[PDB]
Amino acid sequence: TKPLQVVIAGAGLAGLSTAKYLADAGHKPILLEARDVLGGKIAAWKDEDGDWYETGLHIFFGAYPNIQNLFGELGINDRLQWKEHSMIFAMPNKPGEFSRFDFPETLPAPLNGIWAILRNNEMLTWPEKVKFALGLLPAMVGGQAYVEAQDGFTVSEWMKKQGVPDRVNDEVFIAMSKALNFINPDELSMQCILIALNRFLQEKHGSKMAFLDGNPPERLCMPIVDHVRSLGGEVRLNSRIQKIELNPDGTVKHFALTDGTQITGDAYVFATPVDILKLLVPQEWKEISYFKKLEKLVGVPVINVHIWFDRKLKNTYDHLLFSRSSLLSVYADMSVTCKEYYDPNRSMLELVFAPAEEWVGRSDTEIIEATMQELAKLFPDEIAADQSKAKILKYHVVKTPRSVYKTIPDCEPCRPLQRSPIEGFYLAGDYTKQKYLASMEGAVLSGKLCAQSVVEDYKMLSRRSLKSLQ
Amino acid sequence: PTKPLQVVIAGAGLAGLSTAKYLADAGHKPILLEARDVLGGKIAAWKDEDGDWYETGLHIFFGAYPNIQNLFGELGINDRLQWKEHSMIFAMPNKPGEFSRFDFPETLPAPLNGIWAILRNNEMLTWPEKVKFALGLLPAMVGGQAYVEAQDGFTVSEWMKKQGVPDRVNDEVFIAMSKALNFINPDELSMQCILIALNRFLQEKHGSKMAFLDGNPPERLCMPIVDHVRSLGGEVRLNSRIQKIELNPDGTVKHFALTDGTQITGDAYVFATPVDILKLLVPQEWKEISYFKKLEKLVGVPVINVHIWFDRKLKNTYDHLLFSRSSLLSVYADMSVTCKEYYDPNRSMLELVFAPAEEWVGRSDTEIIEATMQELAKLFPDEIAADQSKAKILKYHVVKTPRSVYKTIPDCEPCRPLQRSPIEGFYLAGDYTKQKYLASMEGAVLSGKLCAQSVVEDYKMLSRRSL
Ligand SMILES: Cc1cc2nc3c(=O)[nH]c(=O)nc-3n(C[C@H](O)[C@H](O)[C@H](O)COP(=O)(O)OP(=O)(O)OC[C@H]3O[C@@H](n4cnc5c(N)ncnc54)[C@H](O)[C@@H]3O)c2cc1C
Ligand SMILES: Cc1cc2nc3c(=O)[nH]c(=O)nc-3n(C[C@H](O)[C@H](O)[C@H](O)COP(=O)(O)OP(=O)(O)OC[C@H]3O[C@@H](n4cnc5c(N)ncnc54)[C@H](O)[C@@H]3O)c2cc1C
Ligand SMILES: CNc1cnn(-c2cccc(C(F)(F)F)c2)c(=O)c1Cl
Ligand SMILES: CNc1cnn(-c2cccc(C(F)(F)F)c2)c(=O)c1Cl
């Protein structure tokens, strides 16, 4: 009858998704972004030479249903560059050598996965393969209630209990743990790995990977902004929320911006990271279970390194690679994998530096030195730390000391639903209660779930608007 | 019933309590007479001067106890069973302080969870031993009721050798299981006993899952049954020991004469006492009837239940039952961890079953505690020392039952009596009577249900005999 004016704080994938689905429902979203860039943890920047550098190396999976829906709804499915159904891992014992898990396109799930492990002979011994299959069979047969019960254990703890060899946890699962939450298996919750392993057994192409064809603010965030604006929604940059001002009853009066501007609406959404929300929670809310539980959810440090080399590397892949390094996580030659970043004579390597706890405080030259020392192990005939072989033209080190929430055991009960106990106040973000981890899929789903909760409360939110008018 | 039957029951153990419960449900008037000043019998417990409880035994409730589950549900006390993890934790005699376990996945059904548990465990069985064990047992588990009854002629040690189960498996795994079920070694125990126990692992998914009662059995389990019986018109009387079964000239029961001479009469009479006590009270004129003469084979087995309260809270303990795999001890548990009412955060109490107890029921309490402390020094080598160098004993309680459950030696099954006796108006209840769930709490409760069922089936004949 009358469209709701919903004020959303933060234009990350959660905020952009909340705005997109509220606009589809016929409401008026007001999306306020603190920075001069869209995307949040997917944001990228163009330097003086016209080259892009990102907050992180982002991989889209087949088992990302809400992301697939969003891309389809915006008609940008062709912007995802799907790579070969393989998992390429480096050999730390054999420098320059790589091993891989190839998933046959003729075998369905989980047979393609079982085959990939059976076919590979350099990453697991036959006894190790048997113990691994024994240890995981009860887990894959298990339901949702089973995976939730595993949130009390670390990956290293659960692997030992299920009899999975300690070498399998160190060879295969160190790589998977750092890939999903930038921490080692001795700290990561087993529930995280089980949701990731569910990609391999549910859908056939669930574990298949894709790269975005260019920078995320232009190629993904702009299509969402254009869609929101075309339906009457507002998207404003450099609009940081300074304070959540409250009415005497405890509900939200307005969102006070950094320039003093007070923004009002029928509903209010905080699509900001959990760390920023925790600092902005009003004193009168601080003892409510919903907001007090959030103390367990703390952002994990991560570093995204970009290195442009003078030559085009002769030994590279049109894929993501698991470095199996103690300092690095996943990496990719963006001059090969990304369409907009394609260069035939100059190759660029975008690498995730994790765990980053002891590195976010160190200098960019210190980080580049450590990265070059690790690259000399992956490319021993092409890259040398003293730049004897390939030479660095330029670099970009993007540090996020508080990125996704550290998915340590027992975080799941602390994760809040999109509907808050404060009437008119809602939450969005990868950290909120949703089944697809602290991911791009999690962010988009939390947005869809937030917009859904707002439209479900339309009757109560419209009546509250006119009661205050009296 | 047109006119409710007055049924006199001798013994308020789980069999007597169950007989009284189901007779009251049928609309009859049970008169439950207990010899002692405590309810439960072999599940009875006592509160000492310091207010701490000590039990007749360490009792474990299993998922494969259908009549116990029904009773708890009927009384609405299901929450009084503290279900533990689906695991079987065993001690390592070769490696003191170390423990091995069989974990049953909650995602796999029965017997796959069991097969997985054995496959996953690598320190209690070698791969060849696992194969020989699986081969030896597969025909048995596939077997019907007629097959398990045919195995009653063999000892556990005899049958394991015949089926090709390695002698090390019988000594490693089955010594622990034999002492757990009947407080005797596999060279004496009937194979039928082990097969009924192994049926817990393949029938229901949680059949082998274990539970502890949340407190002392007389208050937490026996009182709810007594309250239920009394609310429906039934009578429960303590310190009422039956001295004699007085007979009419035709051979039937005239009355039950108590210790103080009091004569108690009814339309039907039930003996829910242990087989040893019944055998002594059988009238001379019944003694040569096959039904009562067969009972000579069924003799109570000695058992000792040790309780030790220590000054410290043990750092290395479990919220579970443990198989000591000791030559003197059987199963044990830290009751300060497993039992709700017995919970203590700074003081840990260990309740241990001392079996075989034949050479120990005669020995002093200090002699038994010394032997227990010597065995505990092997299970807790960095926490408990026999000379009390490490953890110190605050107090102890040694409960001896020289004639507990019947010794389930081979060929006892044909001697086990049905609940309906050849004497008109006289019935039997108890774990020893003919029922398929062994000499257990489940057996006791089922025998009670079967006894009450036989009494109500004979209502027409029992009501006419009254007039
Ligand atoms: C190195 C790296 C690699 C990653 N790789 C992957 C991958 O391979 N696959 C995958 O699925 N995910 C990956 N992710 C995770 C993914 O980026 C996040 O899960 C997701 O983008 C977070 O979405 P969000 O919208 O909830 O939060 P954010 O994107 O962080 O959005 C919050 C927004 O709120 C804004 N904001 C903050 N404070 C205020 C304020 N006071 N007022 C207004 N606005 C404010 C911020 O500027 C930001 O734009 C990776 C992340 C990193 C950092
Ligand atoms: C150490 C120990 C550990 C055990 N562990 C387990 C376990 O883990 N799981 C399990 O299922 N079972 C276990 N049991 C077995 C279980 O306790 C018995 O199977 C069951 O309680 C016996 O039930 P019942 O009613 O037939 O006999 P009882 O419980 O012995 O009852 C007979 C009653 O008759 C009374 N009585 C005797 N003479 C007279 C008389 N003349 N007049 C009147 N009353 C009389 C007695 O005082 C007693 O109360 C254990 C037993 C012991 C001792
Ligand atoms: C920050 N979250 C991330 C980050 N990376 N990946 C990821 C990327 C590449 C490979 C893999 C893996 F194959 F290991 F699951 C995960 C995620 O799936 C999630 Cl949920
Ligand atoms: C005196 N009867 C008993 C005594 N103990 N247990 C028992 C308790 C714990 C563990 C096990 C076992 F797992 F071995 F079967 C049996 C019984 O099942 C019966 Cl029937």
**B108:A141 CB<8 A:** yes
Interface of B with A (CB under 8 A): 103, 105-108, 116, 119-120, 122
| Coil/strand/helix, residue A308 | strand
Q: Report the DSSP beta bridge partners of residue A396.
A: A306
- Give B238's DSSP letter: S
Mutate which of B85, B86, B107 to disrupt the A interface (most A C-beta within 10 Å)?
Answer: B107
Q: How far is CA A98 from the centre of its chain?
A: 26
CB-based contact A33:A23 (threshold 8 Å): no
Q: Report the DSSP beta bridge partners of residue B420.
A: B427
A12 lines ligand 1 (CB under 6 A): yes
Which of B84, B74, B13, B79 shows the shortest CA–CA distance to B42? B13
CB-based contact B369:B308 (threshold 8 Å): yes
Which of A468, A469, A464, A447 shows the shortest CA–CA distance to A17? A447
| Coil/strand/helix, residue B253 | strand
Give the strand pairing for A302-309 and A392-400.
Answer: antiparallel
**Alpha-carbon distances, residue B140 vs A324, A389, B222, B461 (angstroms):** 50, 71, 37, 43
**Ligand 4 atom with minimal separation from the B303 CA:** 1
**Coarse DSSP helix, strand, coil percentages of chain A, rounded to the nearest 5 percent:** 35, 20, 40
Give the strand pairing for B426-428 and B268-271.
Answer: parallel
Which of A142, A159, A162 shows the shortest CA–CA distance to B122? A162
Question: Got the DSSP string for B45-66?
Answer: EEE-TTS-EEESS---EETT-H
Q: How far is the CA of A235 from the centre of ligand 3 (A)?
A: 29
Triad B352, B353, B356: Cα angle to 5°:
145
Distance from C-alpha of B145 to C-alpha of B218, rounded to nearest angstrom: 35
Resolution in A: 2.8
Which of B419, B422, B420 shows the shortest CA–CA distance to B435? B419
Q: Report the DSSP beta bridge partners of residue A427.
A: A270
User: Length of chain B, please?
Assistant: 467
**Chain B nearest CA to A25, separation (Å):** 41
Give the strand pairing for B303-310 and B393-401.
Answer: antiparallel
Query: What's at A105, amino acid-wise?
Result: E
Distance from C-alpha of A295 to C-alpha of A275, rounded to nearest angstrom: 9
**Ligand 4 atom with minimal separation from the B404 CA:** 1
CB-based contact B321:B337 (threshold 8 Å): no
| Coil/strand/helix, residue A165 | coil
B431 annotated to bind ligand: yes
Q: How far is the CA of B302 from the centre of ligand 2 (A)?
A: 13
Distance from C-alpha of B123 to C-alpha of B407, rounded to nearest angstrom: 32
Distance from C-alpha of B88 to C-alpha of B175, rounded to nearest angstrom: 14
Give the strand pairing for A241-246 and A86-90.
Answer: unpaired
Q: What are phi and psi of A463, to 5 degrees?
A: -70, -40
Q: How far is the CA of A172 from the centre of ligand 3 (A)?
A: 14
Question: Got the DSSP string for A255-269?
Answer: EEETTS-EE--SEEE
**Any residues with Cβ below 6 Å from ligand 4, and which?**
B 60, 177, 180-181, 197, 321, 331, 405, 438-440
Triad A448, A263, A454: Cα angle to 5°:
25
Give the residue ranges of DSSP H helices in B174-328: 174-182, 191-202, 217, 223-231, 275-281, 290-293
Compute the Cα dihedral for A433, A437, A442, A445 and give only its sign.
negative
